[PDB]
Amino acid sequence: RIERAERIESELEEHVGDQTFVEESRFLEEDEQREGEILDQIIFVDGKRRSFVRITTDEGITGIFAELCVGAVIWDREGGTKTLFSPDKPPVKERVLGFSQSFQEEGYEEVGGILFKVVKEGKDAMQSIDLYMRSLEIEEVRKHMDKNILIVKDGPAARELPFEENVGPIGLVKNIGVTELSKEDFKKLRFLKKGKRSKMFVSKVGAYVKLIDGEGIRGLVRLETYDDNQIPYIRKVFDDLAKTLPHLTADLPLPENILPIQFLEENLSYYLTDKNYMNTRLFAYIG
Amino acid sequence: HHMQVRIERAERIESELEEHVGDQTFVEESRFLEEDEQREGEILDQIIFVDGKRRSFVRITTDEGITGIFAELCVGAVIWDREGGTKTLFSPDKPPVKERVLGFSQSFQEEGYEEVGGILFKVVKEGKDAMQSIDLYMRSLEIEEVRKHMDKNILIVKDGPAARELPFEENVGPIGLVKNIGVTELSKEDFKKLRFLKKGKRSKMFVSSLKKVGAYVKLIDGEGIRGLVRLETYVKDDNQIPYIRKVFDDLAKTLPHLTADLPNILPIQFLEENLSYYLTDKNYMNTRLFAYI
């Protein structure tokens, strides 16, 4: 019996693992899933990465030349969705060279006149790059904290940035491999009607929200963020997003990749360097 | 001072959803057969190469959370003849082995075959993840394709790792040819010496400890690790070592003549390209799979 299906893009694709569960689910027994409304405005923040060239050093270390582009849109119940950047004021774009933390050096690599920041906090090159784009993302959330508008940030919640009043930020999680719930409860989720939410659970607290119809974890998303007097504040935010987010999507052929977010991702991609151009430039100094 | 990054290999990255590539791995001490020495070899008159090609379609998640992958594997062989170069040991009228598989982790508890849209997929589930299960199955298909040619008294070279299921036999091998040399099986300082091997040169043989024997060979000119492959085989009697030594000498001599240094080795490239012909169109398969799932 099938809960999700996705097309495979290449023969080198991530060996994706089975979903992971826990022995017992840390629910909030008193889960008050009240009804919500519709938010006037949500700010969405996300990042796009482009990967150019993989190298191996003389010490055996694998490195990845990449570029990360991060930014934001405003959604508006009245006023659709718009970019917080423009060709005149382009979103942040950073060239990086990712290594595992086994790489002994630090700073910048100049290849072909272009400086690539060495980024090496992860266990391997690509994880180091993902860790870094997360920090740039956090930085972009920080650029609008005082706007008094709810900020939804693609990916995991940001430990660095705990939950505020009318802002968040709130992590939106599409890939739910590590479920945090147990199997008997997760299994249960698949029968959630388009718009319903689970009971909140905590490690840092989370809730799964369903965004379309038909059973199975497509449309299933998980909201999460990081003083227990804040729970009523954010519990409303969860009650308001489970209302609001289904209206910002639809189905066609993806689902969980919500409309404003796809518009944002399209827009960041516009700013990324052409792959063939960049690779040709880099290869003139590597090979 | 300015940052010194010494690059031994560089490769274009094809998509963003790739399995993470890790650093190369080393061992504390290299177990070289120090008595070994490369001697001049002879160009082989014939070699059979065996390889496989896979095409992945759709990834699924079951209700129990097990990630699954629908795929197809196609396996076959070419014979390379020093007079007549390369031919497929298969043809459109006698097509190579093609199997549709549904890969899962060990955690999958059913078995046999799954039908989807009237198409049978063999459940394949030996591994830790779905793709691992697929790779182990093609390896088993490649081993079967080797067995088919053992009778011919011709050297057989299998793309990928040596197969312990097939210990070295005197004229035939098989010999594994490893081109992805991440787990190096040598110490770092010894591994670093290899980038200086010249074309047609091999390291000394080295041993795993029922034993694997291996040597590195340099197939092209120039001093990085492109062109560096590992030949290896499993050996039963240590008195077979002389015979393996000669094969390694002969492959070290012969294989560089079957490469280009320009933009795999050529016979294998031709094999893979031909195998590819027989694989099912992706748009067709994926649409039918998504419809019936």
DSSP character for A142? H
Q: If you search the block for the tokens 């209700």, which residue do you land on?
A: B63
Alpha helices in chain B (DSSP H): 130-147, 188-193, 241-254, 266-277, 282-292
| Yes or no, beta carbons of A54 and B286 under 8 Å apart | no
**Other Cβ atoms within 10 Å of A27 Cβ, number:** 15
Q: Which of B67, B184, B195 sits opposite A16 (nearest CB)?
A: B67
**Residues B67 and B61 sit within 8 Å (Cβ to Cβ):** yes
Residues of A with Cβ-Cβ distance to B10 under 8 angstroms: 53-56, 282-283, 286-287
Residue B65 contacts A, CB cutoff 8 Å: yes
What are the structure tokens assigned to A286, written together? 């590597």
Q: Which of B17, B54, B60 sits opposite A5 (nearest CB)?
A: B60
B106: helix, strand or coil? coil
A62: helix, strand or coil? strand
* Structural domain total, chain B: 1
**Residue B241 Cα, gap to closest chain A Cα (Å):** 30
What are the structure tokens assigned to B20, written together? 């993470």
Our CA dihedral for B87, B88, B89, B91, rounded to 10 degrees, sits at -130
Max CA distance (Å), chain B: 65
**Residues B47 and B157 sit within 8 Å (Cβ to Cβ):** yes
| Yes or no, beta carbons of A107 and B64 under 8 Å apart | no
Q: Domain range holding A131? A: 1-287
Q: Which of B26, B54, B289 sits opposite A11 (nearest CB)?
A: B54
DSSP character for A13? B
Stated resolution in angstroms? 2.2
Please name the method used to determine this structure: X-ray
| Euclidean distance between CA atoms A45 and A69, whole angstroms | 11
Residue B57 contacts A, CB cutoff 8 Å: yes
Angle in degrees, CA B25, B30, B33, rounded to 5: 140
A221: helix, strand or coil? strand
**Residues A1 and B4 sit within 8 Å (Cβ to Cβ):** no
Q: Which of B2, B57, B61 sits opposite A4 (nearest CB)?
A: B61
**Residues A141 and A45 sit within 8 Å (Cβ to Cβ):** yes
| Euclidean distance between CA atoms B50 and B289, whole angstroms | 30
